[PDB]
Design a protein around this ligand. Structure first.
Ligand code: PLP
Ligand code: PLP
Ligand code: K
Lengths: 470, 467
């Protein structure tokens, strides 16, 4: 019922921040003055107050006064950060009101199934993932990674000295992502696949809205992965940057309440299965608030958080206090905490839902789709679409996909080929016949319809040309 | 020449971030389904007003303010469209340009092939610097009293820290140059098992904790040693800009006079090849809670630092870069106006230091010769010496005296807590570091010196006992 055994020797070996016996008659003074710490008094700070002027809904153009939060030098509200503390040296794990908000948010959305967990403020998802790779992987360890993944993760596993072993993704329309049959086979027959590698130490899974594939693991699929995590004693790194952006299944384009969302829409976190702290959940404010914050958090066992703290003290000594201050006060004062912030996530959900269906319509209406040259996985969450290219089985996948990429660029549509998002290119070659599409960037519906048209026009010509740029 | 040979194998090894068909014209105006990032329309924040003080300790002719809008075309400003969006890990271009223009004004490198990189503070710059110069098993020369967290960064790189003795005379430059030359010339006699040092970590101005400032002439001797023995200089300078005129009994500097006559030159100004990496921060001159700074070094050192940053620290907060950049450009009107803000800060720190020194000179502990103070030339720290008899246990008596200071309601840092190696430095650990930066007002500084000096006087009156 603790994960001490899974913490890397490297992260456990890092040390922490008078210690001897005070003399018999020693009494501390009740109001000491300090000449100790190298902190400038807040009087030195150029910034006396900040007004943060907000939108009420995404894409609002600025009857009703505009929503504004005022951040003063001083506050006594325990749910707010003032600039006197916000602009001063702070605990490396984060400001208290932002840590409490993250606890409350995780209790509401994804309550861990054990009591000895904690949160830690990070500088985003990639910061959380590096913290997790460090805390679980020693030099020589193996981490299991989805064969198509968030590429930057491999830099963090490489940094920890770990080898990435690819886990096959099932590309059926009803897929959970990971191919469970091939995952079980890899774990049951480890010595036959990888005779010279130790048994895996961890699994990195983007379980909801998988990047790139868009797949989402069912609750029953997650129970089986967790059960295998117990049986083969590996850690789970859960990355969930947009699992809150749940998307109803496609219907032709032309008021969800919180309780119904939490209960029936939100797919449970691995935290909800975890009894021992073998799960570390990575969150970010990047995709729900803004990437430029460089702010997120992790959720894990007390003992895992303590080891992350000692690592942060070396390589990343705190998220920007000014940003923690702005983000905390906006969430607590304007959005009135957890439920209000969920209501802002549900407004974003509606936009993303409309955007995903529009791009899917733009494709379904295409000649390339109707002839069967292209297909689409309907994503259940997030901002990504798998766009499949039905190349003949016997053509060189990498070679034709690269030739097709040049064609898309010439047709004025930029995409990411799946071969760029692999743990191992040779391993994943045969399933690399897809582009990842993102409908998060477009300014308007016109750009989404036109994006899908250029995409499908380019594939159509490429197929008409006999799989040639011509 | 160039510092290529000085870059660690580890940092040099990190990597960065087919043939077009015949009749391939790109499209004039492509649309993106590529980059996984929200349109700025999704951002909750439309605009930000940052409301400023005109001088330190000002209490709130309308208040000075900066409007940060969603969009700008001013190339010197960062807007929220770009500030709140994914950005280059090295920093926003306006903030990188300000750091360039600032260093050209204050500390122009003596070579052309240097660049800046935005960091999350001095400790972040120092970790970047330890990684970019130190391989597993390398040696770094560190001042025997130092900024202790540096040792976490050097340990992280697998480097051994060798202490360099500090001279404690009232006219010291800091590092004892005679013992430094002895250490380098007789390296195999002091350390027959360690490799030749790879680098030196020096807080050359306003040394933490001692407060000493190396003279230009001393810096020239340290640089020539760095060339002869071929080691990198990590220059850490969080408050060298806060220059302090020598003590005068307490009771309008111009930029050009300050720059020419007050500011001590950076190792950058002696560097001809890029063997110097300067660490700067916004922590001590703007606010610590920014978590913002920059480093200055050779193009190729900065490139390695970029690839390290992609792994362990993927950019200073964009929103913070936005606010600091736009405050410095809109309110302060760039480099010279920011220097005027620094000069107002300087006047404050100058009065505070003289006030603390005054409180100490007036005390019986000072008059009886139980204590002494180095007059700092820059920064926020004072070495407070304890004249223990030569034959007492320095560590035993200084621990006991610290308990006495705490009972008297004065908190200081003992020098023995800021050593590279405690046994090496114990004989010179008979001091406390004092910091006059935290106090709210003059009354707290005077009361602080009184409690400090009373505590030591009681301790010596007690025969060096708590009693
Ligand atoms: C966007 C993304 C991240 C990185 O988020 P940051 O907060 O910008 O570091 C990590 N993982 C996945 C799966 C992502 O899509
Ligand atoms: C304060 C200080 C630092 C650390 O500054 P940050 O910007 O807060 O990381 C480093 N070196 C010295 C000498 C300092 O005094
Ligand atoms: K199936």
């Amino acid at each position: 019922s603790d994960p001490t055994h899974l913490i890397s020797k490297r992260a456990a070996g890092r040390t922490s921040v008078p210690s001897d016996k005070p003399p018999a008659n020693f009494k501390p003074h009740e109001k000491p003055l300090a000449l100790s710490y190298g902190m400038p008094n807040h009087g030195f700070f150029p910034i006396d107050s900040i007004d943060v002027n907000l939108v009420d809904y995404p894409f609002q153009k600025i009857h009703t006064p505009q929503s504004t939060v005022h951040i003063s030098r001083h506050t006594t509200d325990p749910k707010l950060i003032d600039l006197a503390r916000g602009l001063q040296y702070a605990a490396v794990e984060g400001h208290a009101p932002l840590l409490q908000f993250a606890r409350d948010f995780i209790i509401r959305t994804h309550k861990p199934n054990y009591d000895d967990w904690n949160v830690f403020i990070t500088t985003g998802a990639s910061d959380g993932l590096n913290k997790a790779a460090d805390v679980f992987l020693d030099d020589g360890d193996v981490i299991l990674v989805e064969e198509f993944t968030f590429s930057p993760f491999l830099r963090f596993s490489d940094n920890a000295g770990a080898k990435a072993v690819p886990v096959k993704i099932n590309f059926d329309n009803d897929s959970d992502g990971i191919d469970l049959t091939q995952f079980v086979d890899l774990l049951e027959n480890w010595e036959k696949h990888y005779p010279n590698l130790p048994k895996p130490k961890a699994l990195y899974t983007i379980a909801t809205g998988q990047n790139p594939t868009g797949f989402t693991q069912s609750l029953e699929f997650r129970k089986k992965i967790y059960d295998l995590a117990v049986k083969y004693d590996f850690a789970i790194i859960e990355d969930d940057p947009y699992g809150y952006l749940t998307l109803p299944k496609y219907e032709k384009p032309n008021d969800l309440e919180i309780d119904d969302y939490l209960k029936n829409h939100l797919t449970p976190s691995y935290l909800e299965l975890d009894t021992t702290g073998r799960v570390l959940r990575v969150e970010t404010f990047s995709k729900l608030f803004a990437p430029g914050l460089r702010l997120g958090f992790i959720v894990g066992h007390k003992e895992v958080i303590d080891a992350v703290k000692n690592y942060s003290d070396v390589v990343n000594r705190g998220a920007s206090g000014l940003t923690q201050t702005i983000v905390n006060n906006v969430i607590q004062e304007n959005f009135k905490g957890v439920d209000g912030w969920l209501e802002w996530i549900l407004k974003m959900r509606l936009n993303y839902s409309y955007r995903k269906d529009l791009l899917l319509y733009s494709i379904f209406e295409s000649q390339a789709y109707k002839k069967g040259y292209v297909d689409v996985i309907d994503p259940k969450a997030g901002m990504f679409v798998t766009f499949k290219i039905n190349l003949p089985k016997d053509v060189d996948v990498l070679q034709k996909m690269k030739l097709l990429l040049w064609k898309l660029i010439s047709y004025g549509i930029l995409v990411v080929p799946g071969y760029n998002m692999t743990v191992d290119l040779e391993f994943s070659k045969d399933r690399s016949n897809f582009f990842r599409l993102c409908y998060a960037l477009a300014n308007n519906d016109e750009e989404i319809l036109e994006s899908g048209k250029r995409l499908t026009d380019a594939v159509y010509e490429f197929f008409s040309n006999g799989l040639e740029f011509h």
